[PDB]
Subunit: 224 residues, 4 copies
């Protein structure tokens, strides 16, 4: 097993990419703590880790409505703030909580399921895009700092990937979605959740200790 | 006069890069509304703009203490939130407020004084770096949306530039800061505030209409 | 004049972006040496610079047929070699020929007219794309080495800009071209040659001394 | 069983650069590796390597040339400049162009290029070399999305600070000067072993990476971050 003997902490395990992570990571021998705690609440992250015990890998799995099609002028205070409360501030909270034990053992792995909208313009997703950009920046600024304690932190800039929040069955069925994907995605298809978790498995494994603070675009060529 | 006839709204005119902006923009024939409002408060942004009246150019000039040297574990909730409350959330409030008149005229200019820390890793500046990454994301996401209305939105990714909040006289006088800069900046010197303002000037002028949602690194070669 | 008292060497001055560089640069006070030498020949570049005498600015102006639509399998040896012989190998020859006198004075400016196909995937332009990437790497690698001597080397990553080689009047006059351009270019128009030269002007001027080895995307937001 | 079970891999210049770790890692994982030693700077050579090789599922484009560390722009003469391109740029297209027809026939293929982080960010004192690596990166960026329409993956490993004889031979890395540069410039604070580089290439060559198209993955301990 490529994660044999590892204990993995997965945030919001029922949302976004959690289901495929559990399935892939367990079949590679990991013990996956599938947490369901709302990490927008101050203090919650410190407790999840406390109750978790020994963590080898943190899979920071956060998602929020992109509000596709909402314009800049329609991006009101609540919508803007909710993007940050939901995927930005919790990211630092939960990473801060795991790092002490990582630093104790001079070893650790963090994988962030982010978005290729943090790499390049995605139309109609303003507040959301800026929040993923901030996630991306967290990995860019933390990666090399944590690398000094032999901790890897990396960012999956995913897009066109099966999940409820962004590519739900109703959306991907329309003629309009299929024409737009064909124009914009060179590979011409969506990724499966499993393919996403296979990249994360690499980034969570000890096969990837030399990858630090990087954004790997998981997008079928979209941002190329 | 390269800004002849233009009116310019400058945020936090006394902080960060405001002084050099007034100097250079006024020399090129612009009226500069030098604002000192605390755009942290909901509603302030809209009222600066109503009072300002006609605006051809918004210079979004925001700054927060980088808290140099503060590590990830020492980056507490207050410090983290302050970075976003000070330079991220207000940026969208003020850009949302001027865009309506830009869209009526099908013309507009937005210049964001940002950070090269939004482009690449800057040691000991975690919270701040993620916040600058949010600003960069805002320019990347908004730029192409606004450009359909002939509105230019761009990002100056500056570093190693004279200002009080990051390169104040006491910090840059040490013999050993000079050695560090000399290793990290290929040009081997700090930029003057004025040089930064001459880049903002180009981006604010109608000489730069084809520049859309870009991050121009203004850093002596640091991130190259 | 913003180039008052400057002498500018412009390669292939009757091709690509030369005409507009002469007009804009002469308007700003510069003497423009409009060279037509075939710099694909060894020894030519050194002779040109010897004839030119005192140079403050080099505008590396090279272009080659992109063979739009030719695929990887039909990109034969001769087509591949020609792209490098035309725009890659000559670039090093003329910059190497100019740098000695810049190093004596510890001052110089090099502006490269490049392509946004050096930044992002451009359909059906394989050999040409890789040659522009090479140009971009030359700016990226030389930039910081030349900046030690207070010399600026920068790259204009242009696209959707009027010129005979890539956007000649016939090609851009059809309704099909305009509809594709409207989809791919957020600003929704081509740039004028003059607008391109106004960015070169900024990068050739002493207002841009802090810009080192950078690629500035001049593409209506295409690559954003 | 193996992550490349049943796959036939064509590896160029198998004794140079990252070739040896590639053989070892890929074969541990069930691959049959065709370890080519042909000089692909000769026109027509790439086509013959592919024909003589039979069925190919993965091409590992493994090319290196002397970086000429420390050689200045003014010292970069015609022959040095030309040699960097003749050695790692021109053959890259020759060998990919030669293998793609059978990939396109089967609507399936993998290409992994061992490149350089010098193709991503400024690396001191390696001018001609850096621009040749930049051209490799551009090849992947431009070919990547084109080949992806035929279900072929082309990706670029932008490696630095990684075991090899061309760029980290023993005399170079023994000096105090080099050890202090690395500690300052490499967040992880060490060099990679060739095995670790090959494990990334393993991922990119496997069918676990079908969704990675024309990308540059930085394998540099954080140097370019
Ligand atoms: N899948 C996924 C991430 C989402 O950001 C894509 C978009 N827009
Ligand atoms: N000058 C300036 C902006 C600051 O972000 C640089 C740093 N660190
Ligand atoms: N104009 C121009 C540069 C050209 O390379 C754009 C394309 N394709
Ligand atoms: N190729 C290569 C590297 C070599 O030229 C330097 C040594 N030892
Ligand atoms: N500079 C440098 C090293 C890189 O070019 C390849 C490796 N390893």
């Amino acid at each position: 097993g490529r994660l044999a003997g590892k204990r993995v902490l997965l945030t919001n395990a029922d949302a976004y990419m959690g289901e495929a992570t559990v399935q892939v990571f367990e079949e590679e021998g990991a013990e996956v703590i599938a947490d369901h705690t709302d990490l927008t609440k101050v203090g919650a992250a410190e407790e999840v880790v406390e109750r978790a015990g020994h963590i080898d890998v943190l899979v920071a799995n956060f998602a929020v409505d992109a509000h596709f099609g909402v314009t800049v002028l329609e991006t009101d205070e609540e919508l803007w703030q909710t993007a940050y409360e939901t995927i930005v501030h919790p990211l630092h909270r939960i990473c801060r909580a795991v790092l002490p034990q990582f630093y104790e053992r001079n070893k650790g792995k963090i994988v962030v399921y982010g978005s290729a909208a943090a790499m390049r313009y995605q139309e109609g997703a303003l507040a959301y895009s800026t929040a993923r950009f901030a996630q991306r920046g967290y990995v860019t600024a933390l990666g090399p700092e944590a690398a000094r304690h032999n901790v890897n932190v990396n960012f999956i800039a995913q897009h066109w990937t099966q999940n409820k929040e962004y590519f739900w069955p109703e959306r991907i069925a329309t003629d309009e979605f299929k024409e737009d994907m064909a124009r914009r995605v060179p590979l011409g298809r969506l990724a499966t959740a499993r393919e996403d978790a296979l990249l994360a498995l690499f980034l969570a494994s000890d096969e990837s200790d030399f990858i630090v603070g990087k954004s790997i675009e998981f997008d079928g060529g979209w941002a190329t």
